[PDB]
């Protein structure tokens, strides 16, 4: 039956300079005219990789690690954080002078404007300080939050919010994620809607966060310099994104 390939963004579709390789555009091209379905599965927020979708013409994807799945321009599945819990977190973070940034499918908003930790960390991502809206979560679907505090301070948050998971990405900022959910469960929901079968699914990843995915699909492709534990669970290890990794891999796999 029909075959489908899921790509993640960092180190996979985009290179180290965050540019789109010429050979990847070719790859996706050949893949489409060949009848193979192309999609994306990432931990990123939709608005964070809109340019990639526009460039490759991809409108089906698993985002927020499976908490927001879109099939051909439409929302197939969505599981935002529990409103009550986002509030409690906000109020608790506020009491501690720790700011938060709320992310929904379209944008981000800070609970505190012009804050030093948001500036430095967000700038490391090459982003300006998000506009300030302390009550943005009240009538919006918040799929994720950014907690701006040091590690020596996350203890209470981690302790008081077991339904959440914390993954630090900067000295003064950590991702606040939902416990339930995964790219694999997102990838699963889509192949069911597409009538595709596990064995007919392929996936390219680069980070620790892709293990669950590479493990679940019929053919998981790890990449050149991906973490050793990512290659371990992979069914195939291709070259780095820097060396036509997507193209070469798709070739070896006889997909193009």
Please give the CATH topology (third level) of the domain spanning 1-79+180-256.
Rossmann fold (3.40.50)
Say whether 52 sits in a helix, a strand or coil: helix
For 194, residues 6+ apart whose C-beta sits below 8 A from its C-beta are 2, 4, 37, 71
CB 61 within 8 A of CB 82: no
Write the DSSP symbol of residue 58.
-
Residue from 58, 52, 38, 72 nearest 9 by CA: 52
Technique employed here was X-ray
CB 134 within 8 A of CB 83: no
Write the DSSP symbol of residue 49.
S
Give me the catalytic one of 8, 10, 200, 210: 8
Tell me the resolution in Å: 2.6
What is 220-251 written as a DSSP string? EEEETT--HHHHHT-SEEE--GGGTHHHHHHH
| Same-fold call for 1-79+180-256 versus 80-179 | no
Residue from 165, 170, 134 nearest 149 by CA: 170
SS3 track for 171-220: CCEEEEEECCCCHHHHHHHHHHHHCCCHHHEEEECCCHHHHHHHHHCCEE
First to last CA, the chain: 16
- What are the extents of the domains in the chain? 1-79+180-256, 80-179
Whether 235 sits among the annotated catalytic residues: the reply is no
Q: Which helix (H) or strand (E) holds 188?
A: helix 183-194
Say how far apart CA 118 and CA 96 lie, in whole Å: 15
Write the DSSP symbol of residue 132.
B
CATH 3.50.50.60 fits domain 80-179: no
Q: CA 175, 180, 118 angle in degrees (round to 5)? A: 10
| Backbone phi and psi for residue 98, each to the nearest 5 degrees, phi listed first | -100, 125
């Amino acid at each position: 039956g029909r075959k489908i390939v899921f790509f993640d963004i960092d180190g996979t579709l985009l290179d180290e300079q965050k540019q789109l390789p010429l050979s990847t555009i070719e790859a996706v091209r050949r893949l489409k005219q060949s009848g193979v379905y192309v999609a994306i599965a990432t931990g990123r927020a939709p608005f964070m990789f809109e340019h990639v979708r526009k460039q490759l013409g991809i409108d089906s994807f698993v985002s927020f690690n499976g908490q927001y799945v879109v099939f051909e321009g439409n929302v197939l599945y969505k599981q935002p954080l529990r409103r009550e819990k986002v509030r409690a977190l906000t109020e608790e973070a506020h009491k501690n002078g720790h700011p938060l940034v709320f992310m929904d499918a379209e944008k981000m908003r800070a609970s505190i404007g012009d804050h030093p930790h948001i500036h430095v960390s967000m700038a490391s991502l090459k982003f300006a300080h998000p506009p300030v809206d302390p009550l943005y979560y009240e009538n919006k679907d918040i799929y994720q939050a950014l907690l701006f505090c040091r590690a020596e301070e996350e203890e209470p948050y981690v302790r008081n919010y077991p339904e959440f998971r914390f993954v630090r990405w900067h000295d003064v900022s950590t991702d606040v994620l939902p416990a339930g959910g995964s790219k694999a469960e997102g990838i699963r929901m889509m192949i069911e809607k597409l009538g595709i079968d596990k064995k007919d699914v392929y996936a390219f990843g680069d980070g620790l966060n892709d293990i669950e995915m590479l493990s679940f699909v019929g053919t998981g492709v790890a990449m050149g310099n991906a973490h050793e534990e990512v290659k371990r669970v992979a069914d195939f290890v291709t070259k780095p994104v820097d060396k036509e990794g997507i193209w070469y891999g798709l070739k070896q796999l006889q997909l193009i």
